[PDB]
Each structure stands twice: as C-alpha cells, then as structure tokens.
Amino acid sequence: ADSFVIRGNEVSQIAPGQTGNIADYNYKLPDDFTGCVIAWNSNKLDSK
Amino acid sequence: ASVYAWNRKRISNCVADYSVLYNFAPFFAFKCYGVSPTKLNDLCFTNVY
C-alpha cells in the first residue's frame, strides 16, 4: 500500500483505464494487476 | 445549445490532433464505449459527428 491523495473528481477515476494526467504523468496501473483501493474523507482535515 | 433541436457539427476533411484537445483542460466523463480514447492518433476516421 502507498500513500496517495487526489481530486474528488478523480477519486472515482482509480480504475486503470483512465489514461491521462492521472495515469500517463502521475501513476499507471498495469492491466494484469491484482489489488484493492480504499479511501475516506480528507477534505476538512486538510484544506486551505 | 438548447436540447430540443440538437445539431450535428460534422467535422470536415482536416486533422484532429486529439492531444491538442487533451492539452486544453481536464475532462470529466471521458467515457468511450468504442474505440480506445487513448491511441486516437494512428487510426483514421472517415467522419466525426
């Protein structure tokens, strides 16, 4: 597991099919991959 | 547009550097249940509507 945080518009884009800024420039997940994705609220705890 | 008499902007004979459109602003849906919306460069489209 790796620490990660990204936009709430792109929090639903965690699937390895959304190829773009999130994938080609930030992090790409291989097609033959096994793993889980979990998340919780972090907007009020850290915001400016 | 207002959605009651929707038009069809037919893209004529030209070149649609799709990466230029992807360089403008982030996209929200980007969901394409067809051709892969990643390698939209090296295949040729007859007409776009």
Three-state DSSP string of chain A? CCCCCCCCCCHHHCCCCCCCHHHHHHCCCCCCCCCCCCCCCCCCCCCC
**Amino acid of residue A46:** D
Distance CA B39, CA B29 (A): 17
User: Are the C-beta atoms of B28 and A9 separated by less than 8 Å?
Assistant: yes
Elucidation method: cryo-EM
Phi, psi of A34 (to 5 degrees): -120, 140
User: In terms of Cα–Cα distance, which of B48, B24, B23 is closest to B34?
Assistant: B48
Distance CA A8, CA A27 (A): 17
- Chain B residue numbers touching A19 (CB-CB < 8 A): 37-38
**Amino acid of residue A40:** W
A18 at B interface, C-beta within 8 A: yes
User: Are the C-beta atoms of A16 and A33 separated by less than 8 Å?
Assistant: yes
Query: Resolution in A, one decimal?
Result: 3.5
What is the longest distance spanned by two Cα atoms in chain B?
36
Among B26, B28, B37, the residue with its CB nearest the CB of A21 is: B26
- Mutation site, B18, B38, B40, interface A, largest A CB count within 10 A: B38
